[PDB]
Amino acid sequence: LPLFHIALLVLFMVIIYAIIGLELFKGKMHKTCYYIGTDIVATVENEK
Amino acid sequence: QPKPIGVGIPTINLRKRRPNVQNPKSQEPVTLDFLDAELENDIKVEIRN
């Protein structure tokens, strides 16, 4: 019970840092590294 | 006539392959039926049997 002045910070700090991410980074993650005309992702053995 | 036999409709997608590996060459024999090497007839089946 002496932590809901501290846990209320991160929950307000997430809501701050979620919306900043959602404005700046909206939908950047979609472009591919596929092959020539096919449907395989192109990675190198260890790479995500 | 070389060129082995007998498949359904030969479906290939080109979305699945890679610009790569050799795609095996079918160790399948060429076993042609006599009733499919020619026209089928009531006389020839008597000959074949």
Distance CA A12, CA A43 (A): 38
For A36, name the nearest residue in chain B, comparing CA atoms only: B19
Cα dihedral A2, A5, A8, A14, rounded to 10, equals -110
Residues in B touching A39 (Cβ below 8 Å): 15-16
Looking at residue B10, its amino acid is: P
**Contact A40/B18, CB-based, under 8 Å?**
yes
**Contact A36/B19, CB-based, under 8 Å?**
yes
B3 — contact with chain A (CB < 8 Å)? no
Structure tokens at B35: 């009733």
- Cβ distance A40 to B18 under 8 Å? yes
Q: How was this structure determined?
A: cryo-EM
First to last CA, chain B: 25
| CA distance, residue A35 to nearest chain B CA (Å) | 8
- Cβ distance A33 to A42 under 8 Å? yes
H/E stretch holding B45 reads helix B42-48
- Cβ distance B28 to B4 under 8 Å? yes
Cα separations in angstroms, B48 against A28, A46, B8, B35, B41? 70, 61, 27, 9, 10
Structure tokens at A37: 């005309």
